[PDB]
Design an enzyme around this catalytic site. Structure first.
Site, PDB file in Angstrom:
ATOM      1  CD  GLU A  23      41.296  41.950  47.783  1.00 28.91           C
ATOM      2  OE1 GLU A  23      41.577  42.995  48.463  1.00 28.91           O
ATOM      3  OE2 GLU A  23      40.496  41.922  46.806  1.00 28.91           O
ATOM      4  CG  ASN A 350      43.660  47.288  43.275  1.00 21.72           C
ATOM      5  OD1 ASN A 350      43.657  46.391  42.460  1.00 21.72           O
ATOM      6  ND2 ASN A 350      42.578  47.689  43.939  1.00 21.72           N
ATOM      7  CD  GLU A 351      39.219  48.068  41.298  1.00 24.39           C
ATOM      8  OE1 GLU A 351      38.665  48.679  42.240  1.00 24.39           O
ATOM      9  OE2 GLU A 351      38.685  47.104  40.613  1.00 24.39           O
TER      10      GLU A 351
END
Ligand SMILES: *[C@@H]1O[C@H](CO)[C@@H](O[C@@H]2O[C@H](CO)[C@@H](O[C@@H]3O[C@H](CO[C@H]4O[C@H](CO)[C@@H](O)[C@H](O[C@H]5O[C@H](CO)[C@@H](O)[C@H](O)[C@@H]5O)[C@@H]4O)[C@@H](O)[C@H](O[C@H]4O[C@H](CO)[C@@H](O)[C@H](O)[C@@H]4O)[C@@H]3O)[C@H](O)[C@H]2NC(C)=O)[C@H](O)[C@H]1NC(C)=O
Ligand SMILES: *[C@@H]1O[C@H](CO)[C@@H](O[C@@H]2O[C@H](CO)[C@@H](O[C@@H]3O[C@H](CO)[C@@H](O)[C@H](O[C@H]4O[C@H](CO)[C@@H](O)[C@H](O)[C@@H]4O[C@H]4O[C@H](CO)[C@@H](O)[C@H](O)[C@@H]4O)[C@@H]3O)[C@H](O)[C@H]2NC(C)=O)[C@H](O)[C@H]1NC(C)=O
Ligand SMILES: *[C@@H]1O[C@H](CO)[C@@H](O[C@@H]2O[C@H](CO)[C@@H](O)[C@H](O)[C@H]2NC(C)=O)[C@H](O)[C@H]1NC(C)=O
Ligand SMILES: *[C@@H]1O[C@H](CO)[C@@H](O[C@@H]2O[C@H](CO)[C@@H](O)[C@H](O)[C@H]2NC(C)=O)[C@H](O)[C@H]1NC(C)=O
Ligand SMILES: [Cl-]
Ligand SMILES: [Cl-]
Ligand SMILES: [Cl-]
Ligand SMILES: [Cl-]
Ligand SMILES: [Cl-]
Ligand SMILES: [Cl-]
Ligand SMILES: [Cl-]
Ligand SMILES: [Cl-]
Ligand SMILES: [Cl-]
Ligand SMILES: [Cl-]
Ligand SMILES: [Cl-]
Ligand SMILES: [Cl-]
Ligand SMILES: [Cl-]
Ligand SMILES: [Cl-]
Ligand SMILES: [Cl-]
Ligand SMILES: [Cl-]
Ligand SMILES: [Cl-]
Length: 627
Positions: A23, A350-351
């Site tokens: 990222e 994400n997460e």
């Protein structure tokens, strides 16, 4: 300890086991892998008439600079311009510099491509040369080129010039410049937009990647690249999330976005640049899609998801779709790549363990729609495995862990007790980040690692021996973060560090490379290491050659000997190669000592029985041939 190796493989080691996580963090994208050399190149997402809007830009001589909301911008995606004025009563070079991302490497063997857009907001009788170039920060010109412009040019016009320095600079303290003659230019105002300066790129790709970083990533032998996040996918709000379609096409149509690490992303490293890099390296993608949650804590309601589900379908169609059947696939073809790219794996969010209240309906609605469009893709869930219970049943989960070096060797048996019930696991982020178990995310003063150490790499290597032993259910694993600009850091430790001029390969980089380049497709069971002990190993074999890779991690402070018994095999080579990474426990590669810790390769005697003395804090690979 005697290690008896079974001549009968237990399972196939997946082609995907070792890869990279990317990222834009620590200027890993803008200022890093993306080759662009100018910082704040197009004034994206800054507030006009502020000092912060002029970040990285400086006057030459008596130039007057301001970033304005242009009444007539170069494009609606780039609403801001640099307003450059020369006072009356001027002479000599007048203009402005861009300091780059904490410097610019000037190399006499490189050709640079400079470009910019300008217009005169008021027609004038100006006649003279516009010069662009590279100078030392003291003001001495290392390369220049120019073209004739006229004050009657009131339409936005692109300038494209190459630069040939003849000398390399002694260091990276150099700037890009744009100047006019202050006598010819006295009293003039010019508006500029969308500046760019590129060096030669990896595989000569237009709008491509920085060659020393790209080659370092390819050198590790990765099989996949997880992108584009990570936190940087999610946005602070729905409006600031990563969007694929804002990253494709002309740079004049990419608005950029404020990312999740304090800086503007140009989106110059966009979806097609990623996919081209995968094709150029043989990596396959693990591509994330935005799943209705942002980092401010807002989940979209279930009855608000449909347009966001369609945008994830469009993103996938850009990568793999038939150009005759969708607009996004026709767009990929129109950009020069009509063949689909490879895509087997998509990560949903994400997460989402941070937003597990809403993930069940977000998961359900995204995966029901995306699986029906793309029956051949494997979708990866991001909540904690099995809590909450998802529908449809996930084929895979993404597991993240940041811990101490000691935790990694103590948890090398993390996957051994998992059920084998058709679920595969992606270790999508891991690293040993600190020696402080109760304050892992603290400062360097309180135990945080500024750079990976021999201690952190050997701990991670012990944990990786368990990922390999359990690779019947573990299909992929990536250290995070991958990249760090040493002049702009939000997170440490990182796998590969760099400045404007050079790259530092960490201890952890060498551990990842030793595991990924010495990986067979057959797992050979052996005597189990002690669960909670410091000494770990994993054995794999290449089915075609019989090359046999014995990986050994000694994550403790004393030397240990291993007696390898290969007497089950028909034949074992009389010699093998040894590759060792070792050093003092707290030793690191740093900008001051970038090759303090590097692996040593040798050839040793082997056979059906041989002994190895694993030094304290070491990662070793022994390669023999077996049949
Ligand atoms: C493959 O094999 C795995 C392993 O057996 C299966 O995983 C299990 O899945 C089920 C759901 O399908 C999970 O059940 C839920 O359990 C919770 C209670 O959790 C607590 O107790 C568990 C023992 O029952 C324990 O495993 C849990 O431990 C986990 O979490 C902690 C930290 O949170 C961690 O320390 C551990 O390491 C584990 O990670 C935890 O302590 C219960 O609350 C749930 O009930 C809700 O949902 C059900 C079903 O809809 C519903 O009927 C209830 O009314 C309620 O709404 C639910 O029972 C179980 O926890 C999973 N086990 C593990 C080890 O993770 C997996 O399902 C298999 N997959 C396939 C495809 O077969
Ligand atoms: C990347 O793609 C995403 C999509 O996946 C893009 O985001 C979508 O953006 C569109 C366009 O902004 C937006 O759709 C609009 O929602 C508005 C706000 O609720 C609506 O007001 C609007 O309807 C008007 O415009 C339409 C044409 O765009 C007309 O067809 C319609 O009849 C409406 O017209 C009225 O309003 C307009 C002024 O906009 C005016 O000209 C007319 O005269 C009339 O008064 C749209 O339907 C989506 O909601 C966004 N979707 C998502 C998922 O966010 C994103 O912008 C893309 N990014 C880039 C850089 O390209
Ligand atoms: C200034 O830039 C121009 C434009 O890039 C350079 O001219 C190009 O030079 C290359 C290499 O010779 C040619 O292939 C291009 O066709 C040329 N383009 C044009 C439009 O002329 C020129 O070499 C540069 N000058 C210097 C001194 O660096
Ligand atoms: C970018 O970071 C580098 C690496 O830390 C800095 O270079 C160091 O600067 C310190 C302070 O002057 C010196 O003691 C070191 O000798 C330098 N190290 C190296 C390896 O050169 C550099 O100054 C930073 N650049 C900017 C613009 O801040
Ligand atoms: Cl023994
Ligand atoms: Cl057996
Ligand atoms: Cl065999
Ligand atoms: Cl201000
Ligand atoms: Cl600044
Ligand atoms: Cl000056
Ligand atoms: Cl003045
Ligand atoms: Cl004046
Ligand atoms: Cl010139
Ligand atoms: Cl010329
Ligand atoms: Cl938008
Ligand atoms: Cl479509
Ligand atoms: Cl530790
Ligand atoms: Cl700090
Ligand atoms: Cl010990
Ligand atoms: Cl010892
Ligand atoms: Cl023998």
């Amino acid at each position: 300890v005697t290690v008896t190796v079974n001549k009968n493989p237990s399972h196939t080691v997946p082609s995907t086991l070792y890869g990279l996580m990317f990222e834009d963090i620590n200027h890993s994208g803008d200022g890093g892998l993306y080759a662009e050399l100018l910082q704040n190149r197009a004034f994206q997402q800054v507030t006009p008439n502020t000092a912060a809007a002029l970040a990285a830009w400086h006057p030459i001589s008596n130039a007057k600079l301001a970033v304005i909301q242009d009444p007539s911008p170069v494009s609606n995606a780039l609403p801001n311009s640099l307003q450059f004025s020369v006072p009356s009563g001027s002479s000599g070079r007048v203009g402005f510099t861009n300091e780059g991302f904490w410097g610019i490497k000037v190399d006499s063997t490189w050709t640079y491509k400079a470009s910019l857009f300008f217009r005169f907001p008021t027609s004038s009788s100006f006649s003279g040369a516009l010069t662009v170039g590279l100078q030392t920060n003291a003001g001495r010109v290392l390369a220049q080129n120019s073209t004739q412009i006229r004050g009657t040019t009131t339409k936005w016009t692109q300038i494209n010039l190459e630069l040939h320095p003849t000398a390399s600079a002694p260091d990276v303290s150099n700037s890009f410049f744009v100047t006019i003659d202050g006598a010819a230019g006295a009293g003039q105002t010019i508006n500029f937009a969308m500046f760019s300066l590129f060096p030669p790129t990896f595989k000569n790709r237009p709008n491509g990647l920085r060659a020393d970083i790209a080659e370092t990533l390819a050198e590790m032998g990765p099989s996949f690249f997880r992108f584009p996040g990570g936190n940087n996918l999610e946005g602070q709000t729905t409006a600031t999330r990563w969007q694929w379609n804002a990253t494709v096409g002309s740079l004049l149509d990419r608005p950029g976005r404020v990312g999740d690490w304090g800086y503007v992303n140009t989106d110059g490293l966009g979806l097609l640049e990623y996919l081209q890099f995968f094709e150029d390296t043989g990596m396959e993608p693990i591509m994330a899609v935005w799943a209705g949650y942002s980092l401010g804590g807002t989940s979209l309601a279930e009855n608000q998801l449909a347009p966001y589900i369609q945008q994830a379908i469009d993103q996938i169609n850009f990568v793999i779709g038939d150009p005759a059947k969708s607009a996004p696939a026709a767009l990929r073809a129109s950009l020069g790549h009509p063949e689909p790219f490879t895509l087997r794996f998509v990560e949903v969010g994400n997460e989402d363990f941070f937003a597990a209240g809403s993930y069940p309906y977000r998961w359900h609605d995204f995966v029901t729609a995306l699986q029906a469009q793309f029956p051949q893709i494997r979708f990866i869930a991001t909540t904690n495995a099995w809590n909450p219970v998802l529908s449809p049943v996930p084929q895979s989960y993404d597991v993240h862990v940041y811990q101490t070096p000691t935790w990694f060797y103590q948890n090398a048996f993390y996957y051994d007790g998992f059920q084998r019930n058709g679920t595969t696991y992606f270790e999508g982020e891991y690293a040993a980040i600190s020696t402080n178990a109760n304050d892992l995310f603290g400062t360097v003063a309180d135990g945080r690692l500024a750079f990976p150490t021999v201690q952190s790499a050997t701990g991670e290597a012990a944990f990786m021996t368990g990922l390999e032993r359990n690779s019947d259910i573990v299909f992929a694993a990536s250290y995070a973060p991958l990249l760090q600009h040493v002049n702009s850091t939000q997170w440490t430790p990182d796998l590969v560090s760099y400045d404007a001029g050079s790259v530092i390969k960490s201890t952890s980089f060498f551990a990842q490379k030793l595991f990924a380049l010495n990986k067979g497709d057959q797992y050979l069971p052996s005597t189990l290491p002690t669960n909670g002990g410091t000494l770990h190993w994993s054995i794999t074999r290449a089915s075609s050659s019989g090359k046999t890779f014995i990986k050994i991690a000694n994550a403790g402070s004393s030397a240990q000997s291993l007696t390898f018994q290969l007497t089950q095999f028909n034949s074992v080579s009389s010699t093998g190669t040894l590759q060792v990474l070792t050093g003092p426990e707290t030793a690191s590669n740093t900008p001051e000592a970038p090759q303090a810790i590097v692996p040593k390769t040798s050839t040793i005697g082997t056979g059906k029985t041989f002994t190895y003395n694993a030094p304290a804090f070491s990662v070793s690979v022994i390669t023999v041939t077996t049949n």
